[PDB]
C-alpha cells in the first residue's frame, strides 16, 4: 500500500454494475460475499410511490482480469415494498442476515410519533443449496432500556462469534433526555448559542424524540435483540451509521447529519456499551444545505447531510478511503479519496462537475492479496430526476508510481 | 485423461444449482461462458400452459473449491411464452446469439401444416443495445425445403459464420428415396418401406424432416439472411434434435435417434457445406424407447420415439466421449453418466436411484484450470412429484485411473 501524498491520478476506477428511480441503497462486503439492497420507486426519489424492494446477496469474484465482480446468488422481494425500511445486513457462517424495520406510516424517522416499532429479519444464503436459502423472521422480543423504540439505522454491521451487531438507533423522548447545556461547545463560536446541541438531537427543535445511535445485538447461540447505546464522546444526532472490522479491530462510522460536519469515524474501543475513539479528522467533511455547510464546526440547529462513509486501509499510519462529495451546500462533485486525518494523499473524481450524487457506501478487501475497494455511489444521470446506484471498483496502489 | 476400463466409480458428480414444471431446457458452454433456457409451464409438462420462458447467459467460474459454477449474467423473458419454440444458441466474440422459432399454432413439429415459418434471433451480451438485441428474421434460403427451423441446443462459430442445428420440412411428395437402400438384410420382421415412412412423424405425415444446419454470417452484416444446409444421406435418420460443437479444433455432430436406428448417432463432421458427418459405428450406447423401437434396436420399423441424450468428444485419438444416457430399454429412468468408446463403456456412475425418471440430457465439457470438467443438464423428476426440474451436475474426468 502506497502511503505518499501526490496529485497523480494513480487511481483508475472501473465501473462494474424506464421511468423509475432506484433509491435507499445498501452494500455490505465480507470474506468474498456481498449484500445489496435498493428500493425501486416510480417518480420522485424522495416522494415516489414504491414499486419494489429487493435484497440480494452474492459472491465477489475475479475473472482472468483479476478485477472483482458482483455475482448475485440469492434475492428476496417482500410482497409489500411500502412497508420495509432501514435495512442493515451482517454476515455470519455462510449466511447474510438483513434486519429491517416494518412500518405502516412510512419512514419511522419522519412520522416517528405514529410508528409501532415492528422489526424483522431476512437471512439469505451466500451460496444457495437446491429454508437454507431464505428465512424470514418477525422479531417480537426486543430489549431497549430507557428508549421508547429502537430501529436498525445503517448499511452493515459485524459478527463477534455467534453475536451479530447491527447499526441501529434509539428514539428517546426528549423529556427523558439527559444533557447539560454547559457541555455544548460554543467557546470559539460567536454565532452558536448554548442549547443548540440539545435541539440538534432531533429532526425539529420541537421534535418529540431525540435520536441516539448505537448497536442492536443478536446472539445466535440462544430470539432477542438488545439495543446498545453510543458513548457521550462526540455526541451527535442518531444517524445512519456502520460498524465494520478491519485488521481484526472493529471500526465505527457515524454519518454527520448535524452541525458537526467533519467526518465521524474511528476504532471502537468497546462494543458493550458502544465507545468509539473518534479521529480528529480535518480534511473530509460533508455537503450540507444553507444552515450547516461543509467544514462547519459551530453548533447550530440543523438536520441535514448525506451518508458518505470511509474504510480504514492501514492502521499504523491510519490511511483510510471513501467517496466524498466536494460540494458545500450541494450534492455535486463525487470524488474517491485515500486520506489521513490531517492530510489527503490522493484522489480521483468519479463523474463530471455538475454530476449530482447523494450517498456513498465503501467497503474494501483483498482480492488475491491486492487491496481493492468497492464503492456504491448514488449518482444521477445528467438529465436527472433519477438516482441510479453505481458501483465503482478501485485498486489501492502499493507503489506511488506514475 | 484416463483410458482404462474399470467398474470403479471414480466419477463423483456434484450438483451445482409455485405449482409448476420446468421443461424444454437448453444448455451451451463456450470459452468460459454458458447459455441456458427453459419454459415454466403450469401443470402437466406435456400439456401445461406456459408461465415464463427464460433465455440467459452467464459465466462458468470456480471458487476456492476448483469446481465450476453457474453465474447468470444476462436474462431475457419474451412477453409471450406460448409462441417461442426450439431455441438454439451459438457464441461469437462476447455475444451469445440464440435463434428461436415463432409459432401461433404451438410446436411447429406437431402442427406443421398450419405453421407459418417465423424466425427470430436474441443476442445477449455475456458481460453487460449491447446487452440484449432482438431480431425478427425475414430472409431465409432453404432450397427445396418448404420451411426450415432450428432444432437443437447449441451450434458453433467459424469466423463470423454461426452454424445452428436446424431441420427442414420437405413434403414427402418431393422426397427422393429408393426403398432398396433400407437395410433389412438381417432383419426378419422389417419391411422395405419403413425407413421412408420413418422419415416423418406419422407414416401418413405430410412432411418429412431432414436435419442439417442454419448458417448466419456476421461478416455480411447488412439485412438478415439464413441458409439451410441439409445433411449427408449416410446413416440418414429422421430430422431430430441435434447439436454441432467444436472439440480439439475439429467440429463434431450429435444427432438424436428419434427413429428405429437407436444406437447413438455422433461423430466428427468432415465438411460443413453441405453437412457430412462420419458417424461412429458405436455398439454400447443407445437410447430409451417406447414399445416399437426399444433400446439396442437395429431393425428398420415404423416408429417415432426417443429422447435427446447427447455425448461429448473428450479424446479424439481414442475417441473417448462423455455423456449422460438413460439405462432403460422402454422407460425414461435410471440416468447414468458414462465415459465410453465406440465398442466399450470405460466407466460410469448413476446420477439418481433406480426408478428415478429423467427424460433428457445435454452434456458440454471444457478445461477448468487445465482440468477436464463436464457439465451435464439432466431433466430429472422430483421423486413422487410429476413435475420436471432441470438439474445441473458437474463431473470431473480423472486423468489417473486411481481409487
Ligand atoms: C461471410 O461474408 C463475407 C462477405 O464479406 C465472406 O468473405 C468475404 O467475401 C467478400 C465478398 O463477398 C470479400 O470481399 C472478402 O475478401 C471475403 N473475405 C474472406 C473470404 O475472408 C465470408 O467468407 C462469408 N463466410 C462464409 C462462411 O461464407
Ligand atoms: C450467547 O448465549 C450463550 C448461551 O449461554 C452464551 O454462552 C454466550 O456468551 C452468548 N453470547 C454473548 C453474550 O455475547
Ligand atoms: C465552504 O466553507 C468553508 C468554511 O466556511 C470555506 O473554507 C470554503 O471555501 C467553502 N466553499 C467554497 C466553495 O469556497
Ligand atoms: C393446429 O392449428 C390449428 C389451427 O390454427 C389449431 O386449431 C390446433 O389447435 C393446432 N393444433 C395443436 C396446437 O396441436
Ligand atoms: C434390452 O434389449 C436387448 C436386446 O434386444 C437385451 O440384450 C437387453 O437385456 C434388454 N434389456 C432388458 C432390461 O432386458
Numbering used by the authors:
A (entry chain A): 188 to 204, 213 to 325, 329 to 420, 424 to 603
B (entry chain B): 188 to 204, 213 to 323, 329 to 603
Question: Can you list sentences taken from the study reporting this PDB entry?
Answer:
The G proteins of NiV (NiV-G) and HeV (HeV-G) have ~80% amino acid homology, which to some extent limits their ability to induce cross-immune antibody responses. HeV-G and NiV-G share a similar beta-propeller structure composed of six “blades”.
Leveraging structure-guided design, we introduced a single amino acid substitution (S586N) in HeV-G to reconstruct this NiV-specific epitope on HeV-G, which generated the HeV-GS586N mutant. At position 586 of blade6, the nonconserved amino acid S586N was the closest to the 14F8 interacting surface. Therefore, even though only a single amino acid substitution was introduced, the protein conformation was significantly altered, which can explain the strikingly different antigenicity of the wild-type and mutant proteins. Although Asn586 was not directly involved in the interaction with the 14F8 antibody, shaping the molecular framework contributed to the formation of an immunodominant neutralizing epitope.
